[PDB]
Ligand binder design. Structure first.
Ligand SMILES: *[C@@H]1O[C@H](CO)[C@@H](O)[C@H](O)[C@H]1NC(C)=O
Length: 332
């Protein structure tokens, strides 16, 4: 069974401010962190943005969350986007103001990460996992860290990894590199190979390799491919692995892509979510060093589709009541 099993609950306060109230399956209202712990979750993933336009997901914002997550006995997984806004394969926007030369940008990434981690340390919050970037498959901090700029990338990650290493955090969190399409091994292989062959980013600079695994972005995302990809990654670089992002809809009237053949039998419902989340967990667990699974934004009711072509990927009622499927975190 999985060592790390949780959800990314970053939107929680934005939702509370919007008037949302959460309840477990029985209708008992309480702060989300407790409904989560109640269902077997043992860790929350939180996204961190540099200078968000409205302050959400910034350091202060994430510290209030962490403190809360800790009170409910949940572990912490800090997810740096190293951007003012959403960072993903098609968007890695360097924070306005940051440097334009690799040495200074890297230095900045270091000071930023360093100070940020020390922010939790000084606050008495323990960070368990830290991803230096978010789905950085096409690199990060563009233009400099854009893919094929392999040198700059390994250069940037090394600095970021050390911002963590040199912080007051103790124990130090596992450093993770997060790429999307974990089912695509050629991508996982191409990326790490090119980054690790540069020299600046060393094997001892990171501990985990996290991957996003979704069913609605390509019929190619088969459980088998993820299974194979993870095994290939582990056997090749010996790092702990984990699915840091995944969803399953309870409603998907207009999918943009055909779902993988292995899950076309799984229903869009609370039952189907359980089935899917459990299958994905089995894949990760089957892999030696397969250590974690995180469902992305299960409680963002005011954004149900969660940026996908599916209508609802939440594990909550439109009114905020936890669905039965949320307790799948006990079984994994
Ligand atoms: C990083 O921090 C150091 C000392 O704290 C400072 O001298 C340096 O200018 C910073 N790097 C940049 C370019 O922000």
């Amino acid at each position: 069974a999985l060592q790390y099993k949780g959800v990314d609950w970053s939107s929680v306060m934005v939702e509370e401010r919007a008037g949302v109230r959460y309840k477990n399956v029985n209708g008992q209202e309480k702060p989300l962190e407790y409904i989560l712990a109640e269902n077997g979750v043992n860790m929350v993933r939180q996204r961190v943005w540099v200078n968000p336009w409205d302050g959400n997901y910034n350091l202060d914002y994430n510290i209030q969350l962490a403190r809360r997550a800790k009170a409910a006995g949940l572990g912490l997984y800090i997810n740096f986007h190293y951007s003012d806004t959403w960072a993903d394969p098609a968007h890695q926007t360097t924070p306005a103001g940051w440097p334009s030369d690799i040495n200074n940008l890297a230095w900045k990434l270091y000071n930023y990460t360093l100070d940020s981690m020390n922010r939790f340390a000084d606050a008495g919050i323990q960070v368990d996992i830290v991803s230096i970037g978010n789905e950085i498959t096409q690199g990060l901090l563009w233009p400099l860290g854009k893919t094929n700029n392999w040198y700059n990338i390994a250069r940037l990650l090394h600095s970021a990894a050390w911002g963590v290493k040199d912080s007051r955090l103790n124990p130090k969190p596992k450093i993770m590199v997060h790429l999307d399409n974990g089912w695509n091994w050629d991508t996982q292989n191409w990326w790490y190979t090119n980054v690790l062959s540069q020299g600046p980013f060393e094997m001892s600079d990171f501990d985990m390799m996290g991957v996003s695994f979704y069913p609605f972005y390509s019929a190619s995302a088969t459980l088998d491919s993820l299974r194979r990809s993870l095994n290939n990654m582990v056997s090749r670089w010996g790092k702990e692995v984990a699915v840091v992002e995944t969803n399953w809809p309870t409603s998907c009237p207009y999918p943009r892509y055909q779902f993988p053949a292995d899950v076309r039998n799984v229903p869009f419902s609370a039952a189907g979510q359980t089935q899917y989340i459990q299958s994905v967990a089995n894949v990760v667990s089957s892999v030696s060093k397969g250590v974690g699974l995180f469902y992305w934004e299960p409680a963002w009711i005011h954004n149900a589709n969660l940026g996908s072509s599916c209508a609802d990927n939440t594990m909550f009622t439109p009114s905020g009541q936890a669905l039965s499927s949320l307790s799948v975190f006990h079984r994994i």
